[PDB]
Design an enzyme around this catalytic site. Structure first.
Site, mmCIF file in Angstrom:
data_model
loop_
_atom_site.group_PDB
_atom_site.id
_atom_site.type_symbol
_atom_site.label_atom_id
_atom_site.label_comp_id
_atom_site.label_asym_id
_atom_site.label_seq_id
_atom_site.Cartn_x
_atom_site.Cartn_y
_atom_site.Cartn_z
ATOM 1 C CB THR H 42 -0.951 0.038 1.188
ATOM 2 O OG1 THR H 42 -0.201 0.025 2.406
ATOM 3 C CG2 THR H 42 -1.903 -1.112 1.155
ATOM 4 N N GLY H 43 1.846 1.289 -0.887
ATOM 5 C CA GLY H 43 2.600 2.515 -1.024
ATOM 6 C C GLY H 43 1.784 3.606 -1.683
ATOM 7 C CB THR H 44 -0.874 5.602 -1.377
ATOM 8 O OG1 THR H 44 -1.337 5.075 -0.130
ATOM 9 C CG2 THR H 44 -1.311 4.695 -2.520
ATOM 10 C CB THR H 45 1.137 10.519 -0.712
ATOM 11 O OG1 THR H 45 1.795 10.310 -1.961
ATOM 12 C CG2 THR H 45 1.893 11.593 0.020
ATOM 13 N N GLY H 160 5.232 7.443 1.892
ATOM 14 C CA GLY H 160 4.665 6.886 0.685
ATOM 15 C C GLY H 160 5.506 7.212 -0.535
#
Lengths: 241, 232, 127, 228, 236, 245, 48, 238, 246, 200
Positions: H42-45, H160
């Site tokens: 879940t790499g997101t900012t 992220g």
């Protein structure tokens, strides 16, 4: 307190643990040790009883060196007293290893007293039947004298007596103005008090066991040297008559 | 009263098959402060009598009616420390159920797990039963639950019950006044009346404790709410 | 290379049908870096706590904690049935924390359990 | 002391010498030359090795034969049971000394001698426990029990093969050949073949290192003998 | 100086708790074992059979392996525990040495288990005695008996349980080499020994024979009644 | 002593009596009176005060070592009543448990949570046959964050509860009646009034006019949350201010 | 040793009171047999 | 059933079977191109700031990356999806037990300690990088816990893929003591600068949160949000 | 010599604590099991019959263990809860390892080993629970077992445990026909026996719970009879007793 | 080795779960053609794509836990609760996972509302309301499912759509010996169809 006194984990109907009380009477079974704290040190003295003429002088000592600066005078079962001397030595060495300086005497007394108490708690072990006194001297702390009894209660004293004749010796110590005396005059008075409360007929042929820690030993626990002990014994004898 | 030592051991049956040390633990429950549980048609009521009855008690400190989750709540009669140790365990068991199944534990499941802990304590030897019988109130599946777990670890689902002191008279009172179609408000009135049966003098909002469980979840009534219920 | 073959004296006897499949060849290097850290976690936590108690307070403190732990762990349930460890958790402080030992791979439903007498007399040190 | 003893840990805090997360811990690990000698249950890269061996069953026994001589090529497990060497010398010697220890304990308990199947199986178990750890064994257990002459090949890789003709070593390919035999060979004719087979190894060599005669053997019913 | 503890000698030198476990054995149904020439037989009395019972579930003769068998007398639950441990040990020995257990090996193991439970007064001895018949791997028939203390002996014929003494007297007077010549005579001798304590014989008798190189065979009531009829004919 | 349970309805900790009473726990409660000392703790508007007798029946005994007020954390102090060694051991346990709480939860233990932890341990002692209760009572004081002063009383049974004022020791009932009468009238005692209340309770139920050396006083305040033990000069100032009025 | 055979139906070779620990040692037993055989097996295993 | 091979009772926790098997199997499959299943990331900012009387937590979206830990504490996660989920759920249940015993709403430092000591226990092998933030009686607290067990108490933090752009925006435009709208707009703007080549927002405010009433259990809801054929067989049931 | 521990034999070989454990069931409610040609049944007396007791789980006494087995306990209720939990666990462990449902006697044997372990090791109270098992397996078909606190089981064609088990067993032994039992005749016999042995009160379909086990289309069907059917059985019995009188 | 592909879609009061079958194959090495879809309830199914051994282990341990849950609680499990049980098991590996990746597709036994889900090998669930896919061909499976899925389908349109997505996803112009098994769960019945591409 019969019926409630076979275990150290049983309370009498009036909140008394009686095995611990019997252990303190066990301390009353033995000959007397006194410890006097003075203006510049602490002096121990034990009415050591000569069991036989066959024992090498110095055997059955009751004045241990617990650390470089701490001395221990015991009463009660001597096997228990030696085990507690081992425990106190372990505590002092462990503290020095962890923290890099000599263990304060109050902290040492707390550690050993809390061990003794831990034995007064279970059905698996019995209370220690031995009472003892610790005494130290540091330039930054002054003289310090502590007594732990079999229940685990340690207080700080100006003069203490443990053993058979603790009450008579306590009466004799109270006459001393120890707060304004040096270790030498206290050694002479300690010998005198040991000679006074000795029961010459019931018990027989004792030998003095004097020890100090003070500034005259530079905060180092020691046996009183042979000549000073001779002078103290001569004073004690001449005062008895 | 020492039947040949059948009385003093938890792991010895008596010649008649009784275990007369778990029924002495049931005499600790029947000597505790009265409790009432009433399962109405839309909720459950848990009313108890406080032992902390004097003016010198902080009443934001220690409570006898406790929540387990949002929807489960306990009261006891018996020995308070045993209650506290079982309450923290019941809360842990409920949170483990949530962590595994992502759903709040049902009342019956919680009662079963707590009762298994109590049963464990009635079988070893060198240990002592629990001196508490719990009332568990819960709301699952649009349906109220009232359970009771006794020191032996045997739980019962009740419509109404009474524990603690004077509980036989309390149950007799409850039988004559409980009907299934009771609403939660009339249940609170009846529970307060059943407590008032066996009560030692004047009853204030500060010497009884009430906790209800409805669709919205378990909640302990504030002293003002209990004061209002007592005034009617 | 582990050395240690007690092989001076590799006279030990095992039950072949009960040993299952043991591979001392690979029992010297755990399967994961976290295998032993998790296997012995309550052990290591107790050792850490006893060490700080020893070093700060004295011999009495770990001794009393170990004595309480020994006492409560002894009025328990026979090993072929799951226990709650209610008193042991109250003593250790786990009565209000949930770890991953509590929710993963539940001990209460083991999927495998031995014979009653064999498991009791293994706990007694009889093999 | 009594409390730490009632506890029966032993753990390195309830002892003496503890000064952190451990310290000297009763001797900073220093201990004694053992607490228990033997007579009770209780980086050197240059281990030794072996060369050429036969063995066939029979009508009258089992016949081991090895490439002459010095060094040892046949372990004498006990009067009634033999075994050859291949791989590590220490491995073969140690594990079959342990096997002879097991065989004698069995005979003392049960008042009858162990069978060859049981003996080879015990050895196979002992060396299978440490499979993949570098043990190098190539033994070949032969004997005579209530079931007649017995011959097993037990290996450090878990192998345990029964058979009536085995051969290990360099001249194995030439020695298994030349093994044109029959289960009913006369004893003299059997000694003949084993001699000839170790010979058809060394018809390309002669007496020397792992060279000499044939170190022949013969497992009779009442124990083996050394023919020559 | 008394009983009530497993590990306490009395001033005469008696461990009475083990002896009371053997008293527990002496109340069970009589089990008779006779060792023949090429057949070994076991027979237990079916004491107080209930008509509404599945008799398959209350059997006192069990197979430990394909060559070893066992009948017991005493407390049946202890016997179930000991039997299943013996079965695991038979298979484990086969795994260890490939060879079938000798009847002495499994007798020794059973006795060692019972002897483990006669120690440690926090445990309770097994109140059973067993009659372990079988055939060794070389074909010798065997009959052994263990008792609660951990003590085993080899017998030619034996009886354990209630009325073991009368049956053992009968066996001593009647076990010869001419009673053993055939399989049938061994079977009839066991049935005759059991008929010395069994009233209304035949329907209270549980025979099981084991011939060499063959598995345990329980004799159904029809075969047992045929043998009993032969016995009464031979009575004349 | 070795092992076993004593037979009798009042002789082992894990035996109930026919009436479902654990008598060894009640005998521990009587052990609290072993010492002959009474403790008073009083909660005020912005302070909590613990006051205890200081009997030193020995000219030879160094009186600065006799004390029953202990510091658990930097901001929690307690007065221990009962057997002296048991008191000191329970103080040691409370100190360890408070340090663990700060370690695990990152903030300093509250008073209610400390008495809850100590009472959980005490319950464990009452349920098992190897251990025994401690014959001591712990009265804890502290200033929380947003509740205010806190006085809590653990006891040998494993029971704990918060109070506005509490007593332990020989004159626990007489002091409890005194404090009930005082708290019914008014309760927002400033700081001086709480100290006067605690000292007056102790000096009334004992009918003893105190000296600064016969009494110990430890206090926390909202403005000074740290546990403080008053010097003899401060106690003497309070006593003379009470006497003049 | 005195054998004391209890029944004629009992194999005498199974009640032997003299056993062999090793080829040069033999034991004679008296007392509890189950304990005796534990000590005998200890002796045998120790010699090996 | 009584398995013969069991001597000691089984325990709970992580299993660590399949470890050696998976090592051999992954080495073997990688030498053939077989593509074993992988874990979800879940790499997101995720970003958060502290304004005057609260915090604002923000994340990208189609999912929900802002976890619940307490009525006063919330969490965003980057890393392994299962790890952030399980980590936050375990600490949320622990904080429920803590609050339900204490009767106080939790402290953000308690959650930070639990997270950092759990993440230190599993020696970075639980891939949960979190942005913790909440509000207690002490005030707004924002932390950033990393998978190896190291935290960092900060005024603003971002994690992220767009963390650098969002951190640049924060260093440009963050001021102590912003208003709820100012901080909300700043967090949204930092996230947006981190995504361009919707946005979730969690606002925990001090004056929406009573720290004097007794704690009561909150209610929770849930998450997670041609050609022709030839039918060879049919088999209806029931 | 005496009866304080489970680990002590009296000097006639009696384990008195186990005998006392077995004496606790004679207080408990009458559980009855009958085997027929086409099914098995369990008839249990509802002991807890108070007015304010709630309507509960599908059965107070009858517990499902598999798809194929059910039990019916009598004795101490908390021990019974522990034991039924462990029964279900044992069965699922067999299914996990063999991928086949556990046979009935293997489950009974495993639980009885647990109970015997509690009668053998000192400082552990035996289980005051006597269970009654009914099931079906591919080996022996419909089976009915019994178990008592000593871990001592046996298979029956009709047995009773609990209060008045001896009168019930005498009546079954007199009236059970081996081989000619069908589930309807077994239900009639169950009502008759469970009536004549519950003579503290008049039988009504609120103090009895009946569960039948059958096989229908290759699946086992454990079914607890509804309250409106037990009334019909009781009426059939009352009309039969009226006809047989006059 | 081919892990397989398991798919699920929602219709109107109906669910579909499909997996490939491998009709004609004489492959070797690790098992390829295994059973992938296991009934976990009356109207509840789980599909398990991945290593065959781990598929079987997961199915068996899941059935262990599910059977115990249903006996203790006396109620039929719900799809979301099955999701959570599967996640708990998968995560109790986590350091050494099972190489399986499930999809749950079932009907809630109170309102018969469709539920579909898909987890990864350590159990992070994704609950969508249109379709899920799980396997080594998730990219084109996702593309086809997005292109074909229509809201509020009926059993027949559901069957057609899921069959088309599976077939044209595993396609690779290689549907030869590639089968699809499809279970259509509805409130009343469950219809299983095993089907082949018409090209063959």
């Amino acid at each position: 307190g019969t019926g409630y006194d076979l275990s150290a984990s049983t309370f009498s109907p009036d909140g008394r643990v009686f095995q611990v009380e019997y252990a303190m009477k066990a301390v009353e079974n033995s000959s007397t040790a006194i410890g006097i704290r003075c203006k510049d040190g602490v002096v121990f003295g034990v009415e050591k009883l000569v069991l036989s003429k066959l024992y090498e002088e110095g055997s059955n000592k009751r004045l241990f060196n617990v650390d470089r600066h701490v001395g221990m005078a015991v009463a009660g079962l001597l096997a228990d007293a030696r085990s507690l001397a081992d425990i106190a030595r372990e505590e002092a060495s462990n503290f020095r290893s962890n923290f890099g300086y000599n263990i304060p005497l109050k902290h040492l007394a707390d550690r050993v007293a809390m061990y003794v108490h831990a034995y007064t708690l279970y059905s698996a072990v019995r209370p220690f039947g031995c009472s003892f006194m610790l005494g130290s001297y540091s330039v930054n702390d002054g003289a310090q004298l502590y007594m732990i009894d079999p229940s685990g209660v340690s207080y700080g004293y100006w003069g203490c007596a443990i053993g058979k004749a603790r009450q008579a010796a306590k009466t004799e110590i109270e006459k001393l103005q120890m707060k304004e005396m040096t270790c030498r005059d206290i050694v002479k008075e300690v010998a005198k008090i040991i000679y006074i409360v000795h029961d010459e007929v019931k018990d027989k042929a004792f030998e003095l066991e004097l020890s100090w820690v003070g500034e005259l030993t530079n905060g180092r626990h020691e046996i009183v040297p042979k000549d000073i002990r001779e002078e103290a014994e001569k004073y004690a004898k001449e005062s008895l008559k | 009263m020492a039947e040949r030592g059948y009385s003093f051991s938890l792991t010895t049956f008596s010649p008649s098959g009784k275990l007369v040390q778990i029924e002495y633990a049931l005499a600790a429950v029947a000597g505790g402060a009265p409790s009432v549980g009433i399962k109405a048609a839309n909720g459950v009521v848990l009313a108890t009598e406080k032992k902390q009855k004097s003016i010198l008690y902080d009443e934001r400190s220690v409570h006898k009616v406790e929540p387990i989750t949002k929807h489960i709540g306990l009261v006891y009669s018996g020995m308070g420390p045993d209650y506290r140790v079982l309450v923290h365990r019941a809360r842990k068991l409920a949170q483990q159920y949530y962590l595994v199944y992502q759903e709040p534990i049902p009342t019956a499941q919680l009662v079963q797990r707590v009762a298994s802990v109590m049963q464990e304590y009635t079988q070893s030897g060198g240990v002592r039963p629990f001196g508490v019988s719990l009332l568990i109130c819960g709301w699952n599946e649009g349906r109220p639950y009232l359970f009771q777990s006794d020191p032996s670890g045997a739980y019962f689902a009740w419509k109404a019950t009474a524990m603690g002191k004077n509980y036989v008279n309390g149950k007799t009172f409850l039988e004559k006044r409980y009907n299934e179609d009771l609403e939660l408000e009339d249940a609170i009135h009846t529970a307060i009346l059943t407590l008032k049966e066996s009560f030692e003098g004047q009853m204030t909002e500060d010497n009884i404790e009430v906790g209800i469980c409805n669709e919205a979840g378990f909640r302990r009534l504030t002293p003002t709410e209990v004061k209002d219920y007592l005034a009617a | 290379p582990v050395t240690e073959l007690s092989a001076s004296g590799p006279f030990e006897s095992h039950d072949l049908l009960r040993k299952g499949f043991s591979c001392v060849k690979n029992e010297l290097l755990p399967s994961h870096p976290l295998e032993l850290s998790e296997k012995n976690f309550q052990l290591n936590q107790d050792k850490m706590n006893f060490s700080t108690l020893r070093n700060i307070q004295g011999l009495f403190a770990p001794l009393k904690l170990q004595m309480e732990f020994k006492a409560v762990q002894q009025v328990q349930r026979l090993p072929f049935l799951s226990s709650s460890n209610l008193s042991l958790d109250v003593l250790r402080g786990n009565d209000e924390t949930i770890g991953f030992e509590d929710i993963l791979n539940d001990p209460s439903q083991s999927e495998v359990m031995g014979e009653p007498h064999l498991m009791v007399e293994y706990k007694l040190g009889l093999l | 002391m009594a409390l730490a003893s009632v506890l029966e840990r032993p753990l390195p805090v309830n002892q003496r010498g503890f000064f952190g997360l451990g310290g000297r811990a009763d001797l900073l690990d220093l201990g004694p030359g053992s607490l228990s000698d033997g007579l009770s249950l209780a980086p050197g890269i240059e281990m030794l090795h072996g060369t050429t061996t036969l063995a066939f069953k029979f009508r009258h026994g089992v016949i081991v034969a090895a490439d002459s001589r010095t060094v040892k090529k046949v372990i004498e497990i006990n009067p009634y049971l033999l075994g050859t060497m291949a791989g590590g010398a220490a491995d073969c010697s140690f594990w079959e000394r342990l096997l002879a220890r097991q065989c004698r304990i069995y005979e003392l308990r049960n008042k009858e001698r162990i069978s060859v199947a049981a003996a080879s199986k015990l050895l196979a178990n002992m060396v299978y426990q440490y499979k993949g750890m570098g043990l190098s064994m190539g033994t070949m257990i032969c004997g005579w029990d209530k079931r007649g002459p017995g011959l097993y090949y037990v290996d450090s890789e878990g192998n345990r093969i029964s058979g009536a003709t085995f051969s290990v070593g360099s001249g194995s390919v030439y020695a298994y050949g030349v093994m044109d035999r029959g289960y009913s060979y006369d004893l003299e004719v059997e000694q003949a073949y084993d001699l000839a087979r170790r010979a058809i190894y060394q018809a390309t060599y002669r007496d020397a290192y792992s060279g000499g005669a044939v170190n022949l053997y013969h497992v009779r019913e009442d124990g083996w003998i050394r023919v020559s | 100086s008394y009983d009530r503890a497993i590990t306490v000698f009395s001033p005469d030198g008696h461990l009475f708790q083990v002896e009371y476990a053997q008293e527990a054995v002496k109340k069970g149904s009589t089990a008779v074992g006779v060792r023949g020439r090429d057949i070994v037989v076991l027979g237990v009395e079916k004491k107080s059979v209930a008509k509404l019972q599945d008799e398959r579930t209350v059997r006192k003769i069990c197979a430990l392996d394909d060559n070893v068998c066992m009948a017991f007398a005493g407390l049946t639950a202890d016997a179930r525990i000991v039997i299943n441990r013996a079965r695991v040990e038979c298979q484990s020995h086969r795994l260890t040495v490939e060879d079938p257990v000798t009847v002495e090996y499994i007798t020794r193991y059973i006795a060692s288990l019972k002897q483990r439970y006669t120690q440690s007064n926090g445990r309770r001895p097994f109140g059973i005695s067993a009659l372990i018949v079988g055939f060794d791997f070389d074909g010798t028939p065997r009959l052994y008996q263990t008792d609660p203390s951990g003590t085993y002996h080899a017998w030619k014929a034996n009886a354990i349980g209630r009325g073991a003494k009368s049956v053992r007297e009968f066996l001593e007077k009647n076990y010869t080499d001419e009673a053993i010549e055939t399989d049938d005579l061994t079977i009839k001798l066991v049935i005759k020994a059991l008929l010395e304590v069994v009233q209304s014989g035949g329907k209270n008798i549980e025979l099981a024979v084991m011939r060499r190189d063959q598995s345990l065979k329980i004799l159904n009531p029809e075969e047992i009644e045929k043998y009993v009829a032969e016995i009464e004919k031979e009575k004349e | 002593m070795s092992r076993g349970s004593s037979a009798g309805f009042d002789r082992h900790i894990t035996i109930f009596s026919p009436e479902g009473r654990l008598y060894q726990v009640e005998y521990a409660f009587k052990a609290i009176n072993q010492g002959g000392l009474t403790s008073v703790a009083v909660r005020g508007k912005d302070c909590a005060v613990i006051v205890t007798q200081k009997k030193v029946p020995d000219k030879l005994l160094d009186s600065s070592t006799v004390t029953h007020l202990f510091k658990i954390t930097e901001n929690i102090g307690c007065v221990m009543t009962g057997m002296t060694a048991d008191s000191r051991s329970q103080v040691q346990r409370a100190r360890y448990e408070a340090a663990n709480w700060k370690y695990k939860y990152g903030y300093e233990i509250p008073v209610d949570m400390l008495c809850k932890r100590i009472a959980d341990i005490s319950q464990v002692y009452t349920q098992n046959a190897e251990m025994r209760p401690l014959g001591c009572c712990m009265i804890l004081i502290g200033i929380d964050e947003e509740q205010g002063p806190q006085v809590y009383k653990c006891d040998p049974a494993g029971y704990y509860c918060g109070f506005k004022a509490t007593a332990a020791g020989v004159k626990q009932t007489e002091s409890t009646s005194f404090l009930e009468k005082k708290v019914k009238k008014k309760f927002d005692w400033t700081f001086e009034q709480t100290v006067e209340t605690a000292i007056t309770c102790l000096s009334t139920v004992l009918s003893i006019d105190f000296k600064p050396s016969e009494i110990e006083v430890g206090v926390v305040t909202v403005e000074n949350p740290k546990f403080r033990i008053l010097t003899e000069a401060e106690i003497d100032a309070h006593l003379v201010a009470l006497a003049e009025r | 040793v005195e054998k004391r055979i209890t029944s004629p139906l009992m194999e005498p070779s199974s009640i032997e009171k003299i056993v062999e620990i090793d080829a040069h040692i033999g034991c004679a037993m008296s007392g509890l047999i189950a304990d005796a055989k534990t000590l005998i097996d200890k002796a045998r295993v120790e010699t090996q | 059933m009584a398995a013969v091979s069991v001597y000691a009772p089984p325990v709970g926790g992580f299993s660590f079977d399949n470890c050696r098997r998976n090592a051999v199997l992954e080495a073997d499959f990688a030498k053939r191109g077989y593509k074993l299943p992988k874990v979800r990331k879940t790499g997101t900012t995720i970003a958060g700031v502290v304004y005057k009387d609260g915090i604002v937590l923000g994340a990208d979206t189609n999912c929900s990356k802002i976890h619940f830990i307490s009525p006063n504490i919330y969490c965003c996660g980057a890393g392994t999806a299962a790890d952030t989920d399980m980590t936050t759920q375990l600490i949320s249940s622990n904080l429920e037990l803590h609050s339900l015993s204490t009767g106080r709403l939790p402290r953000v430092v308690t959650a930070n300690r639990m997270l950092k000591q759990m993440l230190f226990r599993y020696q970075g092998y639980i891939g949960a990088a979190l942005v913790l933030g909440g509000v207690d009686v002490t005030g707004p607290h924002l932390y950033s816990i990393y998978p190896h067990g190291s935290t960092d108490k900060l005024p603003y933090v971002t994690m992220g893929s767009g963390s650098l752009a969002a951190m640049a925006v924060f260093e440009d435009k963050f001021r102590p003591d912003m208003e709820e709208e100012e901080a909300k707009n700043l967090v949204s703007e930092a996230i947006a600068a981190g995504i361009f080549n919707n946005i979730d927002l969690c606002v925990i405010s001090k004056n929406k949160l009573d720290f004097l009433r007794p704690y009561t259990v909150p209610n929770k809801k849930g998450t997670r949000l041609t050609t022709a054929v030839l039918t060879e067989k049919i088999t209806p049931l029931e | 010599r005496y009866d304080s521990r489970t680990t002590i034999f009296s000097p006639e070989g009696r384990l008195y604590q186990v005998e006392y454990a077995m004496e606790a069931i004679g207080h408990a409610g009458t559980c009855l099991g009958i085997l027929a040609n086409d099914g098995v049944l369990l008839a249990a007396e509802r002991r807890n019959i108070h007015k304010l007791l709630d309507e509960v789980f599908f059965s107070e006494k009858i517990y499902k263990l598999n798809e194929d087995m059910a039990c019916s306990v009598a004795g101490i209720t908390s021990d019974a809860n522990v034991l039924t939990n462990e029964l279900r666990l044992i069965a699922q462990r067999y299914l996990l390892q063999y991928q086949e449902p556990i046979p009935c006697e293997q489950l009974v044997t495993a639980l009885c080993d647990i109970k015997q372990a509690y009668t053998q090791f000192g400082g552990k109270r035996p289980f005051g629970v006597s269970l009654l098992y009914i099931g079906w397996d591919k080996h022996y078909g419909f089976q009915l077992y019994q178990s008592d606190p000593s871990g001592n089981y046996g298979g029956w064609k009709a047995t009773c445990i609990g209060n008045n088990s001896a009168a019930a067993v005498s009546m079954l032994k007199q009236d059970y026909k081996e081989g000619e039992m069908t589930l309807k005749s077994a239900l009639a016999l169950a009502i008759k026996v469970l009536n004549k042995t519950m003579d503290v009160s008049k039988l009504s379909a609120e103090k009895v719970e009946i569960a039948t086990l059958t096989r229908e289309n290759g699946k086992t069907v454990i079914r607890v009879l509804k309250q409106k059917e037990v009334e019909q059985l009781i009426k059939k019995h009352e009309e039969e007793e009226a006809k047989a009188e006059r | 080795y081919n892990g397989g592909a398991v798919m699920a879609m929602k219709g109107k009061n109906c669910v579909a779960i499909a997996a490939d079958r491998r009709f004609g194959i004489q492959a070797q090495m690790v098992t390829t053609d295994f059973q992938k879809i296991f009934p976990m309830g009356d109207r509840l199914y789980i599909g398990l794509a991945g290593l065959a051994t781990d598929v079987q282990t997961v199915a068996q341990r899941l059935k262990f836990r599910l059977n115990l849950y249903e006996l203790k609680e006396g109620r039929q499990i719900k799809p979301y609760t099955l999701m959570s049980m599967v996640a708990n098991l998968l995560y109790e590996k986590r350091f050494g996972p099972y190489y399986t990746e499930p999809v749950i597709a079932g009907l809630d036994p109170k309102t018969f509302k469709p539920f579909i889900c898909s987890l990864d090998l350590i159990g992070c669930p994704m609950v969508t309301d249109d379709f899920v896919v799980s396997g080594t061909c998730a990219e084109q499976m996702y593309g086809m499912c997005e292109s074909l899925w229509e809201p509020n389908m009926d059993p027949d349109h559901l069957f057609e759509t899921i069959s088309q997505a599976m077939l044209n996803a595993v396609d690779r112009d290689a549907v030869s010996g590639m089968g699809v098994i499809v279970h259509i769960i509805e409130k009343d019945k469950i219809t299983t169809r095993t089907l082949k591409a018409r090209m063959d």
